[PDB]
C-alpha cells in the first residue's frame, strides 16, 4: 500500500542516498586539486578544438 | 573515498530507525551492498596510488584489507544473530552500532594518508572493541581480558605518539607521500635506536610478538563471537600494516635492529605451535595458531625484501579469513554444547556431516595446502627467509610440521571417533551456519585464482 | 571442569619462585633465543665477509 | 602466426623426416590421426570460421599507449617534489620494462632447452650466454635495493659502483 | 552450577586439609 | 543439509547462468579488439587502450 | 593438428567430469560406481593413443596454456610436461585404477558410503595425474600435497576406529617431514636458478651443489617410505583393501622415486648424493625384507614387500640408471 | 607563539577591524556542519536524560540547540581564521625583515650529491 | 539463599515450535525473508557479479604495455647489435662524482 509501506520502508533509501552524496562529495573535492590539469610534464597535451578541460 | 565512508555512517541512522524485528535484515543487506561498492578500490595501478584527496589515499596494500574489512561485517551480523535472541531492542541496536563504528574506524584507518590521523584512528579502534568484549561476554574473566587488551596496546602505542610528533618537528611533514619521497638514512646513535624502538614497539605489541602475546588468548577466549572474528581477522593486521608503512624511515638501522625481534618471532612460532598441541580449549588453540601465523608475518616484514612483503600481504588476508572461519565453527559447536572444551563433545561427524566437511576444509586451509593463498604467502616468506639465511629453513619446516599436526589433531578430536553418549541436544545445523561457513570459504578458493589482487604493491 | 580449571586457570596462584623454577625458566626461555641469535649472526657475518671479498658467485640471484 | 613477432621470439626452421615404411603392416598412428582429423579438426575449424566471420562483421581497434620522456633523477633538484615525482614514476616504468625484458630472455632460454632435446647442453649455448649477460646487467641495476626501493637508492648504488670501479682503474693505471 | 570448594586449591600441609581435598576429588584419603 | 545445498546451488546458478550466457555472447559477437597504430593527429579516449570489450566498458563507465 | 597435446590434456580433463557431477542426481543412486569405472576405462583407452604416437616417432612436448602469475622476473604458469615418463605412466596408472575400481565394486558392496569412496578414489587419481604430468615445481608440490591429503582421508575411512586415525596422522607426519626437504629444494632452486620450471633448472645447473639434491632426496625418502621414515607405509593398512591396493602399493608410494627420476640430469652431476641414495635404498630394502620374513598379517607382508621394492628402485637410482627404475615402477 | 603582547592590540576585542579584510567562512563549511551536528547530538541527549521520545520530543528545543551551535561556530571560525592569518603575516614579515638569519639555500642537483648506499641483504 | 534470582532458563529449540527454521529468527515470515535476502545478496549479487567484475578489471597495472615495450626494446637492440640490458641505470655523463685526489 502506497503511503503505508513508506512509513516502514523509508529507511532503505538512506544508504543509497549516502552513496550518491559520497560520490558527489568526491567529485567536488576533486574539483579543488586542478592546479596542474594539462600542465603535467608527461601528459602535456594540446586541447581538442571542442575541448575545454582535459578531465573533470 | 567518501563513497564508502558516507554509507557506513548512514548505516547508523538506518539501524536506529528500523523496526524492532527487522534490524538484522537491513543491516546485513546494506553491509553486503557496501562491500560491493568497496570492490572498485581493488583495481590498483603499477604507479603510485589512488590519491583520492588530501586526506585519504588507497594503495594495493590497503585495497585487500579494506575489502576484507567491508566484507567481514555481514558475517559478524550473521554470527551474532544467534546469541542475541533474548536481548532487548536497544541493546541489539547498540551492538550493531558498535560493529558499525568499528568498521568505520578501520576504513578510515587503512587509508589515512597522514600518520597522526592514522594513529588517532588506530587507537580509536580500541573503544568499541573493549565495550564489545566487556559487555556482551559470557565468562567472568571478560573484565580482566578487557583490561589486558587495553593496557598492553596502550602502553606500547603511547611512545609512538611522541615519536610521531618528534618526527613532524624535525622532518616537517607526516604525509606518507612526502615521508616516502624525502626519506633520509638514520644514523647509528642511541637517540635513533630509541626512535626506532618507539616507532616499532607500538605495532609489534598488537601483532602480537612472542613475549607480548599474553593479551591475545584472553581477549579471544572471553570475547563474544563477533569480537573474536574482528580481532583475529582485521585487528591483528593493523600492526603489520603500520609496520610495513613505517619501516620506510627506519633504514638502515633495521639491518641490525631486527635481530631481537627476528629471533623472538622465529622461536615463538615454534613455541606457540607446540603449545597448540597440548590444549584443552578450542578458542585458545585457534588464538595460539593466530599468534604463530602473525609471528611468521613479523619475520617476513622484518626481512624487508619484495618477496617478503608479497608473502606478508597474502598471509595476512588468508589468515584473516581462515581464523574467522575457525572461530565461527567453534562458536557453532559451543552454542549446542555450552561447555567450550575440545574433548567433551566427540564424533560430531556422524551427527553433523556438512559441518564436518566445513571443519575439514577450514583445517586444510589452515594447514597451508596448495594452491591456496595460505601456502602462497607461506612459501614466499620461506623463500625470502632462506635468501636471508640458509638456516631458517629448519625452523620454518618444524613450524610447518607442527602446524599440520595440531590442525589435524583439532579435526580428529572433535570430528572423528565415537560420539559422546550423554549429549542429546545436537540439533541439525541451521541454514544460517552453513551459509556463514560457505561465505567464509568461497572467497578463499576464489582468490586462489587471482593471487595478484592480494600480493601487495611490490607485485 | 576441575581438570580444565587446574590445567588452565590455577597455575599462577599456586606458583612460587624457587631456584628450580627460576633456573628452568631462565634456561628454557633465554637459551634458545641467544643460541639462535648467535647461529644466525655468525652465518650472516660469514656471508657478508664473502660478499665483501666478492668470492660468492651470486650469478642468476635476481629474485631476493 | 603473425600475432607475435618472429624476430623477438626466434624459432629454428624445424626440419622433419619423411615417412619411410619398411614393412607393409599398416601402422595405427596414421589411421588414428586420419580419423581424429576427420571427426575433431573439421567441426572445430567450422566453428572457428563461424566465430571469425562473426567477429569480422564488427571490427574496432585498441592502441598502445606511448609515454613521453621526462628528466631523470640525475637532473632533479634537491627538494623539487614535482620533478622528483616525475622521475620516480619514469624509473618505475623502466623497472617494469626491464623485468619484462628478462622474462622474454628466460622464455627463449626455456624454449630452446626443451626444443633441443638431449643436446641442449650444446645447441643452446647462445641463449645461455644472452641470459647470463642480461642477468648480470639486471643484478647490477636493481638487485639489493630493498623493499622500499626508489630512484634515489638506485642512483646511490650506481654512484658507489662508479666510485669503486674508478678507484680500481686508477690503482691499476698508476701501478 | 559448581561451588567454590569443588575447584582446585593450593597444596595443603595439614592432614585435615589433605582429607578434605581427597574427598573432593572422589578418592580415598590414603589413595590421594 | 540437503536443503541448504539446494538453496546455495539455486542462487549461485540463478545469477551465474545469465552472466555466463552474456559473457559467451559478447565473446562470440563483439570481442577481441585488434591492435592498430595511433592515427596521426588523433588522441584516443582513456578506455581505448584495452582489449576485451567488457574491460573497455568497465573502464569507460566506472574509472 | 598434432593430436598429442589434445589427447594428453583430454585424458586428464575427462578424469574430472564425475567430480563435477558429484553434486548431480547420479551421485544419489547406485549407478555412480559403474559410472566412475566406465569413465576411468574410457580415459585409459583414450590415453593409450599418445603412447602409440610416442612409440612411433618419439614425440615429446610441454604445454604452458594458462599463465597464472608473474612475480617480477619469474613466471608461474599451468605447465604440463608430456615426456616419455608421463606418457608411459598415464596408461599404467589408469589401467591399475580401472582394475581396482572394478574390484572395489564387489569388495565394498555393503558399505553405505560407497559413492563417496569412489569419489575419493577418483580425486586421488586426478591428483596423482597432476603430480606425474607437472612441469614446474609448484604444480609438482600441488600434486605432492594432494596425494598425501587423499591418503590421509582414505586411511581413516572408518572414523570410529581409533587405529585408523592414528595411522592417518602418522602418515601425514612423515609426509610433512619429507615436505621439509621438498620446500628446502624449492626455495634453493628459486633463489639460485631464478626459476621453478624444469627447463631453466636443468639448463642453469651444470654442477648441482649438495643442498637442493639433499632436499630432493629427503622428500623422496619421506614419500617413498625409506628406512628413516618407513613405518607409515606398513601402518597405512588400516584403510580398506582397495585403498591399500591402489594408493599404498603401486601408484602413490612411487612418487618419491618418480621425483628422483624427474631430476636425473642433476643427480648424475653429484657423487655424494648418489652414494647417499644408494646406501638408503640398500638399508631400507634389507630392513623391510627382513621384517616381512616373519610377519603374520598378509597385508603387512605385502606392504613390506612394497617397501622393499621401493628401496630397490632407490638403489637403482643410486647406480645412475633412472630409466631402469622407471621400468621397474 | 604568545601573540598576547602583540603591539596595537585592543584588549577585549573578539574580532578586530582588520579581520574584515579576510574572506568569511561559507555557510556550508564542513566545520559549521559539524557544529550543527554537535547541537543535534546535544538535543538528542537532552531528550534522553529527561526521559522523553528521543527523536521527536521537542522540535523547537532541538532547532534552538542547532541554531545556537551554528552561530557560535561561525563566529569562532572567523576568529580562528583571523588569528592564523595574523600568524602567517607576522612570519612572512619577520622572514623578510631579517634576511641574514634565513639565507637562500644553494640549490643543488641529485647528480652531484653523494648519498651513501646501504644494501639490503 | 544469597539473593533472589531467576532460575537459569533452558535453551529454546528453534525447530520444536517451527520446523524449517533456517536458524535466523523465531518469526517464520521474517526468518524466511532474512534467509532469502542473505542468500541473494551474499551469493548471487556479491560473490558472482563482484567476482566477474574483478575478473574483467581493466589492465591498469600495465602488464601488456610493459610486454610490448620490452618487445620493441629487445627487437631494436638485437637488430642494431646493442648489448641488450645496460649495466648503468643512469648515463655517466649526467652524473657528477666528487673528486677525491687522495
Ligand atoms: C621473551 C621470551 C621468553 C623469555 C621470558 C622467560 C625467561 C626470562 C624471565 C624468567 C627468568 C628470570 C629469573 C631470573 C631472576 C629471578 C629470581 C627471583 O626472582 O627470585 C625470587 C625468589 C625469592 O627468594 P625467596 O622467596 O626469599 O627464597 C625462596 C627459596 O626457597 C630460597 O632459595 P635458597 O636460599 O635456598 O637458594 C638461593 C641461592 C642458591 O641458588 C641455587 O640453588 C643455585 C644457584 C643458581 C643461581 C646462580 C648460578 O641463590 C644464590 O645464592 C645465587 C645468587 C646469584 O628467589 C628464589 O627463590 C631463587 C633463588 C636463585 C636465583 C636463580 C636466578 C638465576 C637465573 C639466571 C639469571
Ligand atoms: C562454488 C563456485 C563459485 C562460483 C562464483 C562465481 C565464479 C567466478 C568466476 C568468474 C570468472 C569468469 C571469467 O573470467 O571467464 C574466464 C574465461 C573468459 O574468457 P575471455 O578472457 O573473456 O575470452 C578470451 C578470448 O578473447 C575470447 O575467446 P573466444 O571468443 O574465441 O571464444 C569463443 C566463445 C564461444 O566458444 C564456443 O561456443 C565454441 C567453442 C568450442 C567449439 C567446438 C565445436 C563445437 C561445435 C561443433 C559441432 C557442431 C557443428 C558440426 C555438426 C556435425 C557433427 C559431425 O568462448 C566463450 O564464450 C567462453 C565461455 C566463458 C564462460 C565462463 C563461465 C563463467 C561463469 C561465472 C559464474 C560461474 C557460475 C557457475 C556456473 C556457470 C555455468 C555452467 O572463460 C573460460 O576460461 C572458460 C574455460 C575454458 C577452458 C577450456 C578447457 C581447457 C582445460 C585445460 C586444463 C586441463 C587440465 C586439468
Ligand atoms: C580435483 C579438481 C576437481 C575439479 C572439479 C570441480 C570441483 C569444484 C569444487 C570447488 C570447491 C568446492 C567447494 C567447497 C565446499 C564443498 C561443498 C560441499 O559441501 O560438498 C557437498 C557436495 C554434496 O555431497 P553431500 O553428500 O550432499 O554431503 C555429504 C558431506 O558433505 C560429505 O562430504 P564428502 O565426503 O563428499 O567430502 C567433501 C569434499 C568436498 O569438500 C572439499 O573439501 C572441497 C574443497 C577442496 C579444497 C581444499 C583447500 C585447499 C586449497 C585448494 C584451492 C583450489 C581452488 C581452485 C578454484 C576453486 C573455485 C571455487 O571433500 C573432499 O572430497 C576432499 C577434498 C581434498 C582434495 C585435495 C586436493 C586439492 C588440490 C587439487 C588440485 C587443485 C588445483 C588444480 C591445479 C592443476 C590442475 C588443473 O559434494 C561436493 O560438492 C564435492 C565437490 C567436489 C570436491 C572438490 C575437491 C577438489 C576441487 C577443488 C577446486 C577445483 C580446482 C579447479 C580444477 C578444475 C580442473
Ligand atoms: C557517533 C555518535 C552519534 C550520536 C551521538 C549521541 C546522540 C544520541 C545519543 C542519545 C541517547 C539516546 C538513546 O539512548 O537511544 C535511544 C533511541 C531509540 O530508543 P527510544 O525508544 O527512542 O528511547 C530509549 C531511551 O533512550 C533509553 O532506552 P533504555 O534505557 O530502555 O535502554 C537501556 C540502554 C540505554 O542506554 C543507551 O542507549 C546509551 C546511549 C548512547 C550513549 C551516548 C554517548 C554520547 C555520544 C558519545 C559517542 C562516542 C563516539 C566515539 C566512539 C567511542 C564509542 C564509545 O542502556 C543499556 O543498554 C546499558 C548498557 C549500555 C551498553 C554500553 C553503552 C555504550 C555507549 C556508547 C555509545 C557510543 C555510540 C553512540 C551512537 C548512538 C547511540 C544512541 O535512539 C535514537 O532514536 C537516536 C539515534 C539517532 C537518531 C538518528 C535519526 C536521524 C536520521 C534521519 C535523517 C538522516 C540524517 C542524514 C541527513 C542527510 C540525508 C539526506
Ligand atoms: C555480461 C556482463 C558481465 C559483467 C557484469 C559486471 C557487472 C558489475 C556490477 C558490480 C559493480 C561493482 C560496484 C562498482 C562500484 C565502484 C564504481 C563506482 O564507485 O562508480 C560510481 C558509479 O556507479 C554506478 O553509477 C552505479 C553502480 C551501482 C550498481 C552496480 C550494479 C549492480 C547493483 C546491484 C544492486 C541491487 C540490485 C537490485 C536488487 C534487488 C561513481 O562513478 P564516478 O566516480 O562518477 O565515475 C567518474 C568517471 N566517469 C565520469 C567516467 C563515470
Ligand atoms: C620481553 C619480551 C620482548 C620485549 C621486546 C624485546 C626487544 C628489546 C631489546 C632491545 C634491542 C637492542 C637494544 C640495543 C641494541 C644496540 C646494540 C648494543 O646492545 O650492543 C652493544 C652496546 O653495548 C651495550 O649493550 C650497551 C647497552 C647496555 C645497557 C642496555 C640494557 C641491556 C640488558 C637489558 C635487557 C632488558 C630488555 C627489556 C626491558 C624491559 C654494542 O656496543 P657499541 O658498538 O659500543 O654501541 C653500539 C651503538 N652505537 C653505535 C650507537 C654507539
Ligand atoms: C559442486 C561440485 C562442482 C560443481 C562446479 C563445476 C564447475 C567447475 C568450476 C570450478 C573451478 C574450475 C576452474 C575454472 C577457472 C576458469 C576461470 C578463471 O580462468 O578466471 C579467473 C578470474 O577469476 C577471478 O579473477 C577471481 C575472483 C575474484 C576474487 C574476489 C572475491 C569476491 C569478493 C568477495 C569478498 C572478498 C573477501 C577477501 C578480500 C581480499 C582467472 O582470471 P585470468 O586467467 O587472469 O583471465 C580472466 C579473463 N581475462 C583474460 C579477460 C582477464
Ligand atoms: C607491551 C609493553 C611495551 C612497552 C614499550 C615501551 C618501550 C618503547 C621504547 C622506548 C620508548 C621511549 C622512546 C622515546 C620516544 C622517541 C623520541 C625520540 O626518538 O627522541 C630522542 C630522545 O630519546 C629519548 O629521550 C629516549 C629516552 C627514554 C626514556 C624512557 C625509557 C623507557 C624504557 C626504556 C627501555 C625500554 C626498551 C625496551 C622495551 C621492550 C618492551 C618492554 C632524540 O632525543 P633528542 O633530544 O632529539 O637528541 C638529539 C640531540 N643529541
DSSP element (H, E) containing D33: helix D28-36
d(CA B380, CA B311): 5
d(CA B343, CA B355): 17
Question: Of B282, B361, F10, B355, nearest to I23 (Cα)?
Answer: B355
CB contact under 8 A, D78 and H110: yes
d(CA E21, CA G212): 60
Please count the structural domains in chain A.
Answer: 1
Q: B205 C-alpha vs ligand 8 centroid, how far in Å?
A: 15
H55 touching chain B per CB within 8 A: yes
Sign of the dihedral defined by the CA atoms of residues B331, B335, B341, B343, in that order: negative
Q: What is the resolution of this structure in A?
A: 3.3
> Would H49 be classed as within a structural domain?
yes
Give me the long-range contacts of B8-13 (CB less than 8 A, separation at least 24): B8/B34, B8/B100, B8/B103, B8/B104, B8/B107, B9/A18, B9/B104, B10/A14, B10/A15, B10/A17, B10/A18, B11/A15, B11/B100, B12/B97, B12/B100, B12/B101, B13/A11, B13/A14
- CA B266 to centroid of chain Cα atoms: 20
Backbone dihedral angles phi then psi of residue B311, each to the nearest 5 degrees: -65, -35
3-state SS string for B231-245: HHHHHCHHHHHHHHH
Ligand 3 near G66 CB (within 6 A): no
Nearest residue (by CA) to ligand 1, atom 22, is C17
Chain D positions touching C64 (Cβ under 8 A) are: 143-144
Backbone dihedral angles phi then psi of residue I37, each to the nearest 5 degrees: -70, -35
d(CA H79, CA F24): 64
Helix G32-57 × helix G84-107 angle, to 10°: 160
> Would H115 be classed as within a structural domain?
no
Question: Of I97, B250, B251, nearest to D158 (Cα)?
Answer: I97
d(CA B366, CA C53): 44
3-state SS string for chain B: CHHHHHHHHHHHHHHHCCCCCCHHHHHHHHHHHHHHHHHHHHCCCCCCCEECCCCCEECCCHHHHHHHHHHHHHHHHHHHCCCCCCCCHHHHHHHHHHHHHHHHHHHHHHHCCEHHHHHHHHHHCCHHHHHHHHHCCCCCCHHHHHHHHHHHHHHHHHHHHHHHHHHHHHHCCCEHHHHHHCCCCCCCCHHHHHHHHHHHHHHHHHCCCCCCCCHHHHHHHHCCHHHHHHHHHHHCHHHHHHHHHHCCCCCCCHHHHCHHHHHHHHHHHHHHHHHHHCCCCHHHHHHHHHHHHHHHHHHHHHHCCHHHHHHHHHHHHHHHHHHHHHHHHHHHHHHHHCCCCCCCCCCHHHHCHHHHHHHHHHHHHHCCCCCCHHHHHHHHHHHHHHHHCCCHHHHHHHHHHHHHHHHHHHHHHHHCCCCCCCCCCCCCCCHHHHHHHHHHHHHHHHHCCCHHHHCCCCC
- CA I48 to centroid of chain Cα atoms: 14
Contact by Cβ (8 Å): G71, B459: yes
C-alpha cell at B418: 565415537
Taking only Cα atoms into account, the Rg of chain E, rounded to an integer number of angstroms, comes to: 10
Ligand 5 near F22 CB (within 6 A): yes
Ligand 1 near C26 CB (within 6 A): yes
Atom of ligand 3 nearest to the CA of B372: 51
- What does the DSSP 8-state code read for residue D65? P
Ligand 1 near B267 CB (within 6 A): no
Atom of ligand 6 nearest to the CA of B209: 3
C-alpha cell at B207: 601483532
Contact by Cβ (8 Å): D87, D73: yes
d(CA B413, CA B425): 19
Other Cβ atoms within 10 Å of D116 Cβ, number: 16
Contact by Cβ (8 Å): B400, B289: no
C-alpha cell at G261: 627420476
Domain range for A26 is 1-56
Contact by Cβ (8 Å): G171, G178: no
> Would H39 be classed as within a structural domain?
yes
- What does the DSSP 8-state code read for residue H43? H
d(CA B454, CA B310): 8
Give me the long-range contacts of B173-178 (CB less than 8 A, separation at least 24): B174/B114, B174/B115, B174/B116, B175/B113, B175/B114, B175/B115, B176/B57, B176/B113, B176/B114, B176/B115, B176/B245, B177/B48, B177/B51, B177/B57, B177/B113, B178/D81
3-class DSSP state for residue I28? helix
Backbone dihedral angles phi then psi of residue H95, each to the nearest 5 degrees: -70, -25
Backbone dihedral angles phi then psi of residue H61, each to the nearest 5 degrees: -65, -45
In this structure, are strands B57-58 and B50-51 parallel, antiparallel, or unpaired? antiparallel
Which B residues in the span 11-50 are in contact with F, Cβ-Cβ below 8 Å?
40, 43
Taking only Cα atoms into account, the Rg of chain B, rounded to an integer number of angstroms, comes to: 21
CB contact under 8 A, F48 and D62: yes
The partner residues of G80 in beta bridges, in order of sequence, read G63, G134
Residue found by looking up cell 587507537 in the block: B123
Omega cis (within 30) before B252: yes
CB contact under 8 A, D101 and I85: yes
Ligand 5 near I53 CB (within 6 A): yes
Chain C positions touching H121 (Cβ under 8 A) are: 47-48, 51, 64
Contact by Cβ (8 Å): B91, B42: no
Helix B392-415 × helix G162-193 angle, to 10°: 150
Chain D positions touching G206 (Cβ under 8 A) are: 121
Chain I positions touching F12 (Cβ under 8 A) are: 43-44, 47-48
Buried b (16+ CB within 10 A) or exposed e, D22-35: eeeeeeebeebbee
Amino acid at each position: 500500500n502506497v503511503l503505508q509501506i513508506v512509513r516502514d520502508h523509508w529507511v532503505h533509501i538512506l544508504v543509497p542516498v549516502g552513496f550518491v552524496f559520497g560520490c558527489y562529495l568526491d567529485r567536488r573535492s576533486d574539483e579543488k586539486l586542478t592546479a596542474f590539469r594539462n600542465k603535467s610534464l608527461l601528459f602535456k597535451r594540446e586541447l581538442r578544438p571542442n575541448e575545454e578541460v582535459t578531465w573533470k | 573515498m567518501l563513497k564508502i565512508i558516507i554509507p557506513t555512517t548512514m548505516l547508523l541512522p538506518m539501524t536506529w530507525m528500523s523496526k524492532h524485528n527487522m534490524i538484522w535484515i537491513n543491516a546485513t543487506v546494506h553491509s553486503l551492498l557496501i562491500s560491493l561498492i568497496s570492490l572498485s578500490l581493488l583495481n590498483q595501478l603499477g604507479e603510485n596510488s589512488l590519491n583520492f584527496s588530501l586526506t585519504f589515499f588507497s594503495d594495493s596494500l590497503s585495497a585487500p584489507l579494506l575489502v576484507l574489512t567491508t566484507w567481514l561485517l555481514p558475517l559478524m551480523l550473521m554470527a551474532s544473530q544467534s546469541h542475541l535472541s533474548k536481548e532487548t531492542t536497544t541493546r541489539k541496536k547498540l551492538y550493531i552500532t558498535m560493529l558499525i563504528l568499528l568498521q568505520l574506524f578501520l576504513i578510515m584507518t587503512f587509508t589515512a594518508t597522514e600518520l597522526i590521523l592514522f594513529y588517532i584512528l588506530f587507537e580509536a579502534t580500541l573503544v568499541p572493541t573493549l565495550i564489545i568484549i566487556t559487555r556482551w561476554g559470557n565468562q567472568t574473566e571478560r573484565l580482566n581480558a578487557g583490561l589486558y587488551f587495553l593496557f598492553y596496546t596502550l602502553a606500547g602505542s603511547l611512545p609512538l605518539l611522541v615519536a610521531l610528533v618528534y618526527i613532524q618537528n624535525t622532518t616537517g611533514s607526516l604525509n606518507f607521500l612526502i615521508i616516502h619521497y624525502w626519506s633520509h638514512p638514520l644514523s647509528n646513535s642511541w637517540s635513533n635506536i630509541f626512535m626506532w624502538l618507539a616507532c616499532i614497539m607500538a605495532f609489534m605489541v598488537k601483532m602480537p610478538l612472542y613475549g607480548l602475546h599474553l593479551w591475545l588468548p584472553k581477549a579471544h577466549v572471553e570475547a563474544p563471537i563477533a569480537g573474536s572474528m574482528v580481532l583475529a581477522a582485521v585487528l591483528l593486521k593493523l600492526g603489520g600494516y603500520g609496520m610495513m608503512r613505517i619501516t620506510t624511515i627506519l633504514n638502515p638501522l633495521t639491518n641490525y635492529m631486527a635481530y631481537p625481534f627476528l629471533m623472538l618471532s622465529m622461536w615463538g612460532m615454534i613455541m606457540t605451535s607446540s603449545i597448540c598441541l597440548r590444549q584443552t580449549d578450542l578458542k585458545s588453540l585457534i588464538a595460539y595458531s593466530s599468534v604463530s601465523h602473525m609471528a611468521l608475518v613479523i619475520v617476513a616484514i622484518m626481512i624487508q625484501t619484495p618477496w617478503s612483503f608479497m608473502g606478508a600481504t597474502a598471509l595476512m588476508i588468508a589468515h584473516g579469513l581462515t581464523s574467522s572461519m575457525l572461530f565461527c565453527l567453534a562458536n557453532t559447536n559451543y552454542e549446542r554444547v555450552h561447555s567450550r572444551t575440545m574433548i567433551l563433545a566427540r564424533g560430531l561427524q556422524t551427527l553433523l556431516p556438512l559441518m564436518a566437511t566445513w571443519w575439514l576444509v577450514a583445517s586444510l586451509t589452515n594447514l597451508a595446502l596448495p594452491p591456496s593463498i595460505n601456502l602462497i604467502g607461506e612459501l614466499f616468506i620461506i623463500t625470502a627467509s632462506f635468501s636471508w639465511s640458509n638456516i631458517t629453513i629448519i625452523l620454518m619446516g618444524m613450524n610447518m610440521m607442527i602446524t599440520a599436526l595440531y590442525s589435524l589433531y583439532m579435526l580428529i578430536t572433535t570430528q572423528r571417533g565415537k560420539y559422546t553418549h550423554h549429549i542429546n541436544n545436537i540439533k541439525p545445523s541451521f541454514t544460517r551456519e552453513n551459509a556463514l561457513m560457505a561465505l567464509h570459504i568461497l572467497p578463499l578458493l576464489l582468490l586462489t585464482l587471482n593471487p595478484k589482487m592480494i600480493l601487495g604493491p611490490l607485485y | 571442569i576441575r581438570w580444565t580449571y587446574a590445567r588452565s586457570a590455577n597455575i599462577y596462584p599456586n606458583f612460587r619462585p624457587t631456584p628450580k623454577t627460576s633456573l628452568l625458566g631462565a634456561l628454557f626461555g633465554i637459551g634458545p633465543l641467544f643460541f639462535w641469535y648467535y647461529v644466525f649472526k655468525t652465518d650472516r657475518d660469514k656471508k657478508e665477509k664473502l660478499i665483501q671479498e666478492g668470492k660468492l658467485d651470486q650469478t642468476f640471484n635476481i629474485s631476493y | 602466426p603473425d600475432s607475435w613477432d618472429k624476430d623477438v621470439y626466434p624459432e629454428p626452421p624445424r626440419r622433419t623426416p619423411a615417412p619411410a615404411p619398411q614393412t607393409s603392416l599398416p601402422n595405427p598412428v596414421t589411421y588414428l590421426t586420419k580419423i581424429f582429423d576427420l571427426l575433431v579438426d573439421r567441426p572445430v575449424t567450422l566453428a572457428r570460421e563461424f566465430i571469425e566471420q562473426q567477429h569480422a562483421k564488427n571490427r574496432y581497434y585498441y592502441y598502445h599507449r606511448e609515454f613521453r620522456r621526462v628528466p631523470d633523477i640525475t637532473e632533479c633538484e634537491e627538494k623539487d617534489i614535482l620533478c622528483m615525482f616525475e622521475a620516480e614514476m619514469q624509473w618505475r616504468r623502466d623497472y617494469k620494462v626491464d623485468q619484462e625484458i628478462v622474462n622474454i630472455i628466460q622464455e627463449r632460454l626455456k624454449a630452446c632447452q626443451q626444443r633441443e632435446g638431449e643436446s641442449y647442453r650444446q645447441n643452446c649455448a647462445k641463449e645461455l650466454e644472452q641470459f647470463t649477460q642480461v642477468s648480470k646487467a639486471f643484478q647490477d641495476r636493481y638487485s639489493d635495493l630493498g623493499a622500499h626501493y626508489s630512484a634515489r637508492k638506485c642512483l646511490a648504488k650506481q654512484k658507489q659502483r662508479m666510485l669503486a670501479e674508478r678507484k680500481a682503474a686508477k690503482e691499476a693505471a698508476a701501478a | 552450577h559448581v561451588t567454590k570448594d569443588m575447584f582446585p586449591g593450593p597444596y595443603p600441609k595439614t592432614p585435615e586439609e589433605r582429607a578434605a581435598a581427597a574427598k573432593k576429588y572422589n578418592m580415598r584419603v590414603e589413595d590421594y | 543439509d540437503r536443503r541448504f545445498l539446494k538453496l546455495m546451488r539455486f542462487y549461485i546458478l540463478l545469477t551465474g547462468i545469465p552472466v555466463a550466457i552474456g559473457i559467451t555472447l559478447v565473446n562470440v559477437f563483439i570481442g577481441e579488439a585488434e591492435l592498430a597504430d595511433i592515427p596521426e593527429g588523433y588522441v584516443p579516449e582513456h578506455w581505448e587502450y584495452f582489449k576485451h570489450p567488457i574491460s573497455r566498458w568497465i573502464a569507460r563507465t566506472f574509472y | 593438428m598434432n593430436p598429442f597435446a589434445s589427447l594428453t590434456l583430454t585424458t586428464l580433463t575427462i578424469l574430472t567430469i564425475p567430480i563435477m557431477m558429484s553434486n548431480s542426481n547420479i551421485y544419489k543412486t547406485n549407478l555412480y560406481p559403474n559410472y566412475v569405472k566406465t569413465t576411468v576405462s574410457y580415459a585409459f583407452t583414450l590415453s593409450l593413443v599418445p603412447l602409440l604416437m610416442f612409440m612411433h616417432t618419439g614425440q615429446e612436448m610441454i604445454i604452458s596454456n594458462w599463465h597464472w602469475m608473474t612475480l617480477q622476473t619469474v613466471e608461474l604458469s599451468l605447465s604440463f610436461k608430456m615426456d616419455y615418463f608421463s606418457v608411459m605412466f598415464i596408461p599404467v596408472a589408469l589401467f591399475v585404477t580401472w582394475s581396482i575400481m572394478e574390484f572395489s565394486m564387489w569388495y565394498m558392496h555393503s558399505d553405505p558410503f560407497i559413492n563417496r569412496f569412489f569419489k575419493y578414489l577418483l580425486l586421488f587419481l586426478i591428483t596423482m595425474m597432476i603430480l606425474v604430468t607437472a612441469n614446474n615445481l609448484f604444480q609438482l608440490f600441488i600434486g605432492w600435497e594432494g596425494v598425501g591429503i587423499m591418503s590421509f582421508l582414505l586411511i581413516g575411512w572408518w572414523h570410529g576406529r581409533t587405529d585408523a586415525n592414528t595411522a592417518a596422522l602418522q602418515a601425514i607426519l612423515y609426509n610433512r617431514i619429507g615436505d621439509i626437504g621438498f620446500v628446502l629444494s624449492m626455495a634453493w632452486f628459486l633463489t639460485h636458478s631464478n626459476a621453478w620450471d624444469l627447463q631453466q633448472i636443468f639448463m642453469l645447473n651444470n654442477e648441482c651443489p649438495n643442498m637442493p639434491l639433499i632436499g630432493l632426496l629427503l622428500a623422496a625418502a619421506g614419500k617413498s617410505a625409506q628406512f628413516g621414515l618407513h613405518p607409515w607405509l606398513p601402518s597405512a593398512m588400516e584403510g580398506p583393501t582397495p585403498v591399500s591396493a591402489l594408493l599404498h602399493s603401486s601408484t602413490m608410494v612411487v612418487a618419491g622415486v618418480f621425483l628422483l627420476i624427474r631430476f636425473y640430469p642433476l643427480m648424475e652431476t653429484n657423487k655424494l648424493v648418489q652414494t647417499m641414495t644408494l646406501c638408503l635404498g640398500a638399508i631400507t630394502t634389507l630392513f623391510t625384507a627382513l621384517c616381512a620374513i616373519t610377519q603374520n598379517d598378509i597385508k603387512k607382508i605385502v606392504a613390506f614387500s612394497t617397501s622393499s621394492q621401493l628401496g630397490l628402485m632407490m638403489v637403482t637410482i643410486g647406480i645412475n640408471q633412472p630409466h631402469l627404475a622407471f621400468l621397474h615402477i | 607563539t604568545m601573540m598576547s603582547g602583540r603591539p596595537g592590540r585592543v584588549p577585549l576585542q573578539f574580532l578586530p577591524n582588520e579581520a574584515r579584510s579576510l574572506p568569511p567562512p561559507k555557510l556550508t563549511d564542513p566545520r559549521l556542519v559539524y557544529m550543527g551536528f554537535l547541537g543535534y547530538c546535544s538535543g538528542l541527549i537532552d531528550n534522553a536524560i529527561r526521559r522523553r521520545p528521543v527523536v521527536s520530543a521537542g522540535l523547537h528545543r532541538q532547532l534552538l540547540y542547532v541554531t545556537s551551535f551554528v552561530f557560535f561556530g561561525y563566529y569562532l571560525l572567523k576568529r580562528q581564521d583571523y588569528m592564523y592569518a595574523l600568524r602567517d603575516h607576522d612570519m612572512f614579515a619577520y622572514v623578510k625583515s631579517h634576511p641574514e638569519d634565513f639565507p637562500e639555500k644553494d640549490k643543488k642537483t641529485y647528480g652531484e650529491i653523494l648519498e651513501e648506499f646501504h644494501p639490503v641483504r | 539463599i544469597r539473593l533472589q534470582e531467576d532460575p537459569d532458563p533452558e535453551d529454546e529449540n528453534l525447530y520444536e515450535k517451527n520446523p524449517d527454521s533456517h536458524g535466523y529468527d523465531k518469526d517464520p515470515i521474517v526468518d524466511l525473508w532474512n534467509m532469502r535476502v542473505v542468500f541473494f545478496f551474499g551469493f548471487s549479487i556479491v560473490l558472482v557479479l563482484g567476482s566477474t567484475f574483478v575478473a574483467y578489471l581493466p589492465d591498469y597495472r600495465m602488464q601488456e604495455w610493459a610486454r610490448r615495450e620490452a618487445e620493441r626494446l629487445v627487437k631494436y637492440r638485437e637488430a642494431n647489435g646493442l648489448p641488450l640490458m645496460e649495466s648503468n641505470c643512469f648515463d655517466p655523463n649526467k652524473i657528477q662524482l666528487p673528486e677525491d685526489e687522495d
